[PDB]
Ligand SMILES: *Cc1cc2c(cc1C)nc1c(=O)[nH]c(=O)nc-1n2C[C@H](O)[C@H](O)[C@H](O)COP(=O)(O)OP(=O)(O)OC[C@H]1O[C@@H](n2cnc3c(N)ncnc32)[C@H](O)[C@@H]1O
């Protein structure tokens with residue numbers, strides 16, 4: 091049994107590779123072929139503790155956990171094969187009041203999902219885990235119906251399923267080489283023979299980086315070491331009739347579960363103490379590594395062993411049977427890379443799983459859907475393989491992975507900041523100047539100003555679930571923009587140059603707005619065939635046939651990949667250049683923006699010559715610039731596109747020329763306060779692959795009646811005719827000392843009916859603003875709802891948008 095032709099080749103037979111093979115086969119894909127080096131489970135999969143919880147600290151990753159567990163419950167019936175899925179429930183423990191607040195944070199984030207999750211009192215915790223030291227226990231975060239599974243049995247069951255639905259699993263059959271073909275397909279080489287695949291999928295665990303390099307890519311992955319300790323039989327544990335639920339001791343930084351009639355616990359030790367396989371990056375994985383472990387090192391986890399011994403006293407007397415030290419393939423931010431890869435044809439990845447056992451199931455069905463449908467079934471850009479780039483070096487990867495390990499169980503605050511591996515090489519000379527004058531935020535390698543320091547006010551990273559040290563400074567920056575004139579570093583924007591004969595036709599088919607006339611810029615959306623908002627851009631028509639597309643920092647390669655695929659798919663004759671790192675951008679915005687800038691250029695910046703949304707090349711003080719009259723602040727302003735090496739000089743000259751006007755800096759936190767007042771939607775919060783543009787309120791940018799048949803046009807017609815079920819609305823609410831940031835539950839009459847997507851304090855009205863999705867019948871202006879913030883429901887009112895009109899809209903009523 092050998093197939094030389096395959097629809098999809100999956101490289102790697104860990105839980106992830108097998109799960110995917112199963113889903114694709116079951117979903118009806120013919121000639122699915124999986125190639126495994128040695129045997130199924132030979133990588134990290136066989137050694138794992140097998141914890142599978144409904145809990146995730148994120149958002150749509152809850153779906154992945156949800157689908158995994160639901161699958162795992164049904165595999166034994168479906169395949170006729172046991173999986174040893176224990177489901178006593180999981181409890182994360184709170185021993186400080188700040189950790190109780192974290193649970194409240196996580197509850198409002200979880201109440202608008204199907205995932206079942208509660209905060210429980212000590213009494214209840216003690217009932218479920220009677221061997222727990224209750225001295226310090228304040229609360230538990232409890233997910234009933236989950237637990238842990240046997241990684242081997244799971245993978246074996248998934249393999250029988252895959253085989254039952256038509257998949258072919260070959261091993262030993264290592265992939266030794268990979269050659270792309272001009273038609274976009276692949277020749278795959280193994281010792282057993284050649285497969286010509288329409289697409290290939292990397293699922294090769296801690297060999298994923300090596301497989302990537304067969305096709306000239308560098309996957310930012312480093313294998314880390316992780317240990318758990320298995321205890322001998324304990325009388326008090328054997329005596330119990332029901333299994334103990336899975337714990338996490340957050341302050342002690344270890345997970346703990348029942349294993350037979352003993353216990354099993356695995357620490358996440360300090361980032362200073364953890365160990366990883368730097369040698370395996372430099373030299374690759376030792377060949378003949380497989381089905382094997384590293385030497386135990388109890389000494390480096392002692393601090394956490396002791397915290398466990400005191401928290402579960404019974405450990406004190408138990409003996410240790412075994413210690414499992416093995417490798418996990420980490421990416422820098424601890425999350426995997428799951429999706430199709432930019433800059434090559436028909437290569438997909440499902441790699442770098444810190445938590446592969448829990449993610450395998452959901453990721454299989456997710457990737458299957460994306461592969462079969464040409465768009466993801468829900469948004470998981472947080473796992474986009476191309477959120478990383480050239481900046482994500484081996485040195486950055488190593489240091490960030492180390493930090494992500496040691497940070498496994500720290501308190502997760504909103505607006506969290508991490509400093510390992512920073513700054514990357516992805517900076518301009520402007521970084522040296524402004525680093526001491528603000529809190530720099532991390533954005534795909536860039537250092538971007540969040541908020542600026544004020545004399546006689548605390549500057550330090552001071553994270554909180556409530557308002558903190560940046561609150562008043564952000565208010566001043568807000569004033570700065572409304573009253574005077576602010577300067578902001580917008581350099582992180584993804585920037586693409588499109589030209590060639592079919593430039594216009596390509597864009598007209600990609601985007602749902604009309605293509606602007608030369609000299610003009612407009613806001614435009616790339617929709618998926620289902621009519622989901624894959625991206626929000628601005629399109630500048632700079633010279634005939636030649637365009638500049640701008641998108642958010644987090645959307646750079648994500649968007650480029652989509653655009654490049656449409657170009658190749660439709661045989662479009664174009665040249666596409668990623669110029670993200672060649673150019674810097676400065677936003678100058680506020681009433682005195684024209685005044686200040688005019689001083690520095692012979693170009694006429696009067697409202698007469700330079701209309702809103704025009705784009706023009708000029709010089710700002712002998713520095714060449716492409717200036718667009720636009721601002722996501724909604725106030726009068728320009729964005730100044732220039733060479734990266736000119737950012738420092740340009741900035742200097744602008745701040746100098748704005749002396750009179752009391753020019754100053756502003757950052758992204760303030761920007762968010764401004765755009766929200768103007769009712770501007772942000773991609774990733776108000777819309778993404780989970781939303782169509784009509785429910786999100788982007789009607790103004792969607793031209794259904796333009797001749798060209800743009801992607802998603804028909805789905806939109808059909809959606810509109812059917813009538814909307816929900817609508818994005820803008821909410822106001824008085825709060826004590828906490829602002830919505832998005833992802834919070836919206837309640838009405840004792841039931842959750844929707845969620846906030848983003849938020850901010852509005853300094854103009856002295857109330858919190860938020861965007862939220864609610865059912866159409868409750869989307870009327872004036873409607874009262876409640877927003878759940880940090881354990882309290884605050885009443886909220888839907889308001890007429892926008893709260894504040896944009897400067898161009900204000901200027902237009904002056905005449906009228
Ligand atoms: C070490 C560890 C990991 C772990 C854990 C406890 C320990 C001590 N506890 C976990 C837990 O409680 N919950 C959880 O979700 N995960 C846990 N882990 C991590 C888990 O083991 C990994 O995340 C997961 O196993 C990764 O699975 P994946 O399918 O992504 O990768 P793999 O199992 O390593 O499989 C890779 C396979 O690919 C084959 N391979 C390699 N190169 C090739 C080529 N060239 N051609 C074909 N096949 C190839 C390997 O042989 C391997 O089988």
Ligand SMILES: Nc1nc2c(c(=O)[nH]1)N[C@@H](CNc1ccc(C(=O)N[C@@H](CCC(=O)O)C(=O)O)cc1)CN2
Pocket residue numbers: 612613626627628640641642703718720721722729770771772773896
């Ligand atoms: N370059 C540029 N491109 C961008 C952003 C930017 O920050 N600047 N930011 C991202 C966010 N999206 C928008 C959305 C709307 C506007 C905007 O300005 N809206 C005006 C004008 C719309 C119109 O009438 O054409 C309004 O009043 O609604 C700006 C960026 C995407 N690309």
